[PDB]
Coordinates of C-alpha atoms and ligand atoms in Angstrom, one line a residue:
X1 CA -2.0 -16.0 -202.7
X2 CA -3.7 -14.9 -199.5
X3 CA -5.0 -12.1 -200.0
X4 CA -4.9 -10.0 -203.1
X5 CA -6.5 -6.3 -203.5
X6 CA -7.3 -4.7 -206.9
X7 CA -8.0 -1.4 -207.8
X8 CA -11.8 0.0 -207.6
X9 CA -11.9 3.5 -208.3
X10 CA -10.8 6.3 -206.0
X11 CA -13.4 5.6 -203.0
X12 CA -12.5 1.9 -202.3
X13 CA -10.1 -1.7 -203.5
X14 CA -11.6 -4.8 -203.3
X15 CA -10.1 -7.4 -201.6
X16 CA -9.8 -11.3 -202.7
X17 CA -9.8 -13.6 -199.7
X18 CA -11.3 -17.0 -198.5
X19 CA -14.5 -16.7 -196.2
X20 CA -12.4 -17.2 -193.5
X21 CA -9.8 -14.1 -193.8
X22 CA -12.5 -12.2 -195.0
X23 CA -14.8 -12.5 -191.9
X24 CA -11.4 -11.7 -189.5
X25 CA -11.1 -8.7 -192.2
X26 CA -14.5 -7.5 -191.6
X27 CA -13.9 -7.4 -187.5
X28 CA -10.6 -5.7 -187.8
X29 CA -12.2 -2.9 -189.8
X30 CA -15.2 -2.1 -187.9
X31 CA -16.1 -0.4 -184.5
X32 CA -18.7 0.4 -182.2
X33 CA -21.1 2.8 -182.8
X34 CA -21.3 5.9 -180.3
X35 CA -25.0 5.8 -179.0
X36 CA -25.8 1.8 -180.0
X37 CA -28.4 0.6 -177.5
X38 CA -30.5 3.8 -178.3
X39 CA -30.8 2.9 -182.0
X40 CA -33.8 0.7 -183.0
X41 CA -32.1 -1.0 -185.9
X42 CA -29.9 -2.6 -182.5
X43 CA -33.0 -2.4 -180.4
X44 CA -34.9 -4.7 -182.4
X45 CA -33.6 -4.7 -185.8
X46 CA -30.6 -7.1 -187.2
X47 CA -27.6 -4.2 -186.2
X48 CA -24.9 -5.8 -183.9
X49 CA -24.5 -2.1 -183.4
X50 CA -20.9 -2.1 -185.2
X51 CA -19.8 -0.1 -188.0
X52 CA -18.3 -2.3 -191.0
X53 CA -16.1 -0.5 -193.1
X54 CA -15.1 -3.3 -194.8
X55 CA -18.6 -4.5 -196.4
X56 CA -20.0 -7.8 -197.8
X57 CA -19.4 -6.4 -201.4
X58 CA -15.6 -6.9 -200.2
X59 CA -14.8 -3.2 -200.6
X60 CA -12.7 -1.1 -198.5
X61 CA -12.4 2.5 -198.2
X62 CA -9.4 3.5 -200.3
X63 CA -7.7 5.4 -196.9
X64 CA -7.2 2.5 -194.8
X65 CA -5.4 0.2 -197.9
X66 CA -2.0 0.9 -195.5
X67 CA -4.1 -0.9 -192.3
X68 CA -4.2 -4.0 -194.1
X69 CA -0.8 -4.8 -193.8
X70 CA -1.3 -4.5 -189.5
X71 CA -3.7 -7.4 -190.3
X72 CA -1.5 -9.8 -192.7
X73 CA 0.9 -9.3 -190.2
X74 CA -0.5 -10.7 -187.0
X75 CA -2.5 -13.6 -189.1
X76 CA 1.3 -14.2 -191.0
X77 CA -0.9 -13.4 -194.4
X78 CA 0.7 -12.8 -197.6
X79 CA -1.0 -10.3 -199.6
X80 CA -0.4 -9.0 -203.2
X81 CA -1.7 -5.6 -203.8
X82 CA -2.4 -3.4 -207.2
X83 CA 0.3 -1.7 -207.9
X84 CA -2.0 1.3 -209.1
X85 CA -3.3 1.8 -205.1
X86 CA 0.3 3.2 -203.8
X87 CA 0.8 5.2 -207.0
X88 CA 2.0 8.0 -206.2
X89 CA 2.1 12.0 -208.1
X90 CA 4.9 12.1 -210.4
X91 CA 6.4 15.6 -208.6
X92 CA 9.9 15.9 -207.3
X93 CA 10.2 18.6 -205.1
X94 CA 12.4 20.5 -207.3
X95 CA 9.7 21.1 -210.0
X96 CA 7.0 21.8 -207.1
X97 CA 9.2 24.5 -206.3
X98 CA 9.6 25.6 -209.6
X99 CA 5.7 25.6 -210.0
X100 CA 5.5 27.3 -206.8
X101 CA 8.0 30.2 -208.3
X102 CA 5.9 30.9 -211.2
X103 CA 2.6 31.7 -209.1
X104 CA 2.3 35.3 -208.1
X105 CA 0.3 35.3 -204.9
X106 CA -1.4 37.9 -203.2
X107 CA -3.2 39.5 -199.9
X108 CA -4.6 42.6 -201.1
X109 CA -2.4 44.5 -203.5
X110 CA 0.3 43.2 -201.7
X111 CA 2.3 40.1 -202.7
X112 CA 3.0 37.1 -200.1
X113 CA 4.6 34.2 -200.0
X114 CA 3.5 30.9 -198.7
X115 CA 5.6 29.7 -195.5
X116 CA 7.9 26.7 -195.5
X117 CA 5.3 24.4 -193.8
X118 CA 2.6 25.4 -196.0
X119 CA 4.4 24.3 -199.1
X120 CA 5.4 21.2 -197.0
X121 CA 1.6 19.9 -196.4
X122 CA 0.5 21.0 -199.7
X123 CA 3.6 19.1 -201.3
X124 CA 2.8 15.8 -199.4
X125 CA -0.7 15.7 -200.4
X126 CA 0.0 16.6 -203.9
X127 CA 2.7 13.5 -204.0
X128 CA 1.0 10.8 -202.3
X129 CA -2.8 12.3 -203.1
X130 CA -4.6 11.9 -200.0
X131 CA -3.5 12.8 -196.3
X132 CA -5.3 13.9 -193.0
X133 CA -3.3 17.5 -193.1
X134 CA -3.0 18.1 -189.2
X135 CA -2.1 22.0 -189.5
X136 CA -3.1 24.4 -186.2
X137 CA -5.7 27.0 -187.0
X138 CA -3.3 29.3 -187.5
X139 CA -1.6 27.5 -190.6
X140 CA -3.7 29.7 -193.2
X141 CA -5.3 26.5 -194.4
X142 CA -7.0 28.5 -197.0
X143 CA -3.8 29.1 -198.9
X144 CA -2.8 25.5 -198.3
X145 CA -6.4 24.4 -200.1
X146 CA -6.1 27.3 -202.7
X147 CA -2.7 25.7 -203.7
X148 CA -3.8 22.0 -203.7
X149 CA -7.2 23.2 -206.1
X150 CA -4.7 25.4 -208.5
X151 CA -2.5 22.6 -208.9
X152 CA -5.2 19.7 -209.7
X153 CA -7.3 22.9 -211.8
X154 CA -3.5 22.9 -213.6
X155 CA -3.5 19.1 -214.2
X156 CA -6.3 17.4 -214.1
X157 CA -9.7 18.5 -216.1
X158 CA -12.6 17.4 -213.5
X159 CA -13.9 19.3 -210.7
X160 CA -13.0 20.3 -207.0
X161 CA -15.3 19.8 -204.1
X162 CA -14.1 21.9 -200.8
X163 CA -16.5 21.5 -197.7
X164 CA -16.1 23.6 -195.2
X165 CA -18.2 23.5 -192.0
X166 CA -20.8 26.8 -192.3
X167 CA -22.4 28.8 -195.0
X168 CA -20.3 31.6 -193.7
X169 CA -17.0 30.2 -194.1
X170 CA -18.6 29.2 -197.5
X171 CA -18.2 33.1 -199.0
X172 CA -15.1 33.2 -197.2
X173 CA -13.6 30.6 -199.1
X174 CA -14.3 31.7 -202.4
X175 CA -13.2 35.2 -201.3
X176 CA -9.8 34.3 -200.0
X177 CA -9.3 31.7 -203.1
X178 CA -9.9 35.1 -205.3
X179 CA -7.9 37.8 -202.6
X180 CA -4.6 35.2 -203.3
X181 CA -5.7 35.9 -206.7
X182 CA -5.1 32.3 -207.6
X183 CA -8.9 32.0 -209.3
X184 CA -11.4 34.0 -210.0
X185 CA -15.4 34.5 -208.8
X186 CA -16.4 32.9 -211.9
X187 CA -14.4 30.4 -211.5
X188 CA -15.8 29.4 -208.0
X189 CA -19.8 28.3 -207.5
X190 CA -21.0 28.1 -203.9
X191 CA -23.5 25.7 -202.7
X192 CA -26.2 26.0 -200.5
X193 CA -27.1 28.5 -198.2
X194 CA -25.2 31.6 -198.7
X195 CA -24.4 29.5 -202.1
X196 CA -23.1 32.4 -204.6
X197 CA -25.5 35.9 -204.7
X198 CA -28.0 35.5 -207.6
X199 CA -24.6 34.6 -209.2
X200 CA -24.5 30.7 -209.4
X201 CA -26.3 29.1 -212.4
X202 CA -22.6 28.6 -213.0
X203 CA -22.1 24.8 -213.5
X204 CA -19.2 25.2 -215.8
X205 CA -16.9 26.3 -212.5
X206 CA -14.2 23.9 -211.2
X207 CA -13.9 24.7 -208.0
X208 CA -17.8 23.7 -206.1
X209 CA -17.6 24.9 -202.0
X210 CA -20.7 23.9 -199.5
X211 CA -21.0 22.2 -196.6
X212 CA -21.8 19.1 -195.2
X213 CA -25.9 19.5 -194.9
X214 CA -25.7 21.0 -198.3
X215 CA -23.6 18.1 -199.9
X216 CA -24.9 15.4 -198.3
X217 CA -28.3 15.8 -200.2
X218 CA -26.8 15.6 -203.7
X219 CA -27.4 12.6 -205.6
X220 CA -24.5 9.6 -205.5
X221 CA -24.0 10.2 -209.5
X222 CA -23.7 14.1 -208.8
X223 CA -19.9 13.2 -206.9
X224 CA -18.5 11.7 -210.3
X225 CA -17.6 14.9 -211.4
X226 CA -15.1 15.8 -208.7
X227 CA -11.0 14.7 -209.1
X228 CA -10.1 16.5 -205.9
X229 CA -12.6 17.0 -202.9
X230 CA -10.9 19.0 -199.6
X231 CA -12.9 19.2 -196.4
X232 CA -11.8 21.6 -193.9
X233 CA -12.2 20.8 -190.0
X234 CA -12.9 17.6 -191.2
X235 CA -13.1 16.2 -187.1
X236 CA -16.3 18.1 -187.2
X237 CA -17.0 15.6 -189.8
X238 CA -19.8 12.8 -188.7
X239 CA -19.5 8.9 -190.0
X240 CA -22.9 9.1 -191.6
X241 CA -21.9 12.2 -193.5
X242 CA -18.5 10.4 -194.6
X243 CA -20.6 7.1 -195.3
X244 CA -23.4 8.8 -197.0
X245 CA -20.9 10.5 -200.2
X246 CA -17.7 8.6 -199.9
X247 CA -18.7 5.4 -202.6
X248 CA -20.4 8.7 -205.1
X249 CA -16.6 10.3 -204.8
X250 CA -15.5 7.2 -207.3
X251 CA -13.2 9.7 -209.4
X252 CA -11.6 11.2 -206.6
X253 CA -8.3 10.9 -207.1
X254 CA -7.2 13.8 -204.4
X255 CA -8.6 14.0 -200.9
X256 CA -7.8 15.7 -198.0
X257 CA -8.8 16.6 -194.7
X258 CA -7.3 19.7 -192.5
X259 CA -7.5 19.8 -188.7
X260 CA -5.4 20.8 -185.6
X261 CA -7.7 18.2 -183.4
X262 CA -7.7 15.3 -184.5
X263 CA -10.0 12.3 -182.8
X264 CA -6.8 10.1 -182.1
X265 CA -8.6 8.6 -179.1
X266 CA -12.4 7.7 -180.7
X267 CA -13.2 4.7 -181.5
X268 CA -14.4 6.3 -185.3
X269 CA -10.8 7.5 -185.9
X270 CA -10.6 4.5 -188.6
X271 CA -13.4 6.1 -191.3
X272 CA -11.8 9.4 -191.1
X273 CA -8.4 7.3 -192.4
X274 CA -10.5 5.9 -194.5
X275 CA -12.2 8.9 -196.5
X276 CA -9.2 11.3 -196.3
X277 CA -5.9 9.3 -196.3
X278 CA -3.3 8.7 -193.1
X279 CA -2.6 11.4 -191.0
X280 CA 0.2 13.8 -191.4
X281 CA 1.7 16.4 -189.4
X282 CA 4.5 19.0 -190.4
Ligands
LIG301 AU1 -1.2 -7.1 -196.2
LIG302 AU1 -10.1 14.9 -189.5
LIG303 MG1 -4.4 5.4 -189.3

């Protein structure tokens, strides 16, 4: 019909369009750059100084799929779109209770229980697989990302990525995951800086947790491997970060992205849609 978008792994869909639609596409999904006029590729290069998340190649980051239809509706298109995109986890909230009943978590040696809003953000991720989590602070993310990476490490058999935004908070990842008691040290390989003690080497671990200036250097193929990927603070986040590993994340079936400020009012807000999922807020 008018537009029709397929399935292309879990970093983008493709959209089918005339030349016409397609060039209106491309303007609705892009954005001034913050600092264009100061960057030579603008200067004197060909750069119009706009971000384009919609590319020549036709591909759009998977996130903004539920944008599209703000489009078709002011240029009265009619759009067919792969079924597969809004697939959703087959959970009801009755048997993510039940899973949640059967996990014995812990702070210290004594046992704790996740609060109702806690289960509520980790249950819509799980369900629709990638969400902006907009939690305060306070919200004990960790045990919100330590429930997300249990359930996927239950389910799925590839690997999860969790950035978090110093080499600090790195250790203190992978030591709350193992204080819940939900995985182990062995289990967890830290990247980078304060990136395990002498004690990585360990490849074989499904949970990988780094951050940003770490992860950005890996190699696109080096992304593959990850089926849930979890950034925490993800406003502190930059577009060439996001830009530089979201097309190696083509297996990423889960994403999410945790922050109490959210950049609602930048003109960027669009590729932070577009690499973790629409917003939600409990
Ligand atoms: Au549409
Ligand atoms: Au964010
Ligand atoms: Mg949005």
């Amino acid at each position: 019909m008018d537009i029709k978008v397929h399935f292309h792994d879990f970093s983008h869909v493709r959209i089918d369009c005339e030349e016409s639609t397609f060039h209106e596409l491309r303007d609705f999904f892009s954005f001034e750059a913050d600092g264009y006029r100061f960057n030579p590729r603008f200067r004197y290069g060909n750069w119009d100084g706009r971000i384009r998340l919609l590319d020549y190649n036709r591909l759009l980051p998977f996130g903004l799929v539920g944008q599209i239809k703000k489009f078709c509706d002011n240029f009265g298109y009619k759009a067919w779109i792969d079924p597969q995109i809004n697939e959703k986890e087959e959970l009801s909230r009755k048997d993510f209770d039940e899973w949640l009943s059967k996990l014995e978590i812990y702070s210290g040696n004594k046992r704790i229980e996740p609060h109702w809003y806690q289960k509520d953000a980790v249950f819509e991720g799980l369900v629709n697989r990638r969400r902006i989590l907009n939690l305060p602070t306070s919200a004990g993310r960790s045990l919100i990302q330590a429930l997300l990476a249990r359930y996927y490490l239950e389910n799925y058999e590839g690997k999860i990525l969790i950035i978090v935004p110093t080499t600090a908070l790195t250790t203190q990842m992978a030591d709350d995951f193992v204080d819940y008691r939900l995985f182990s040290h062995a289990m967890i390989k830290k990247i980078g800086g304060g990136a395990s003690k002498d004690d990585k080497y360990k490849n074989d671990a499904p949970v990988v947790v780094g951050t940003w200036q770490t992860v950005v250097k890996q190699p696109k193929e080096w992304f593959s491997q990850f089926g849930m990927m979890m950034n925490d603070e993800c406003h502190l986040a930059t577009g060439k970060s996001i830009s530089s590993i979201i097309s190696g994340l083509n297996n990423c079936m889960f994403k999410f992205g945790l922050s109490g400020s959210l950049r609602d009012g930048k003109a960027n807000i669009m590729q932070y849609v577009g690499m973790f999922g629409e917003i939600f807020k409990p």
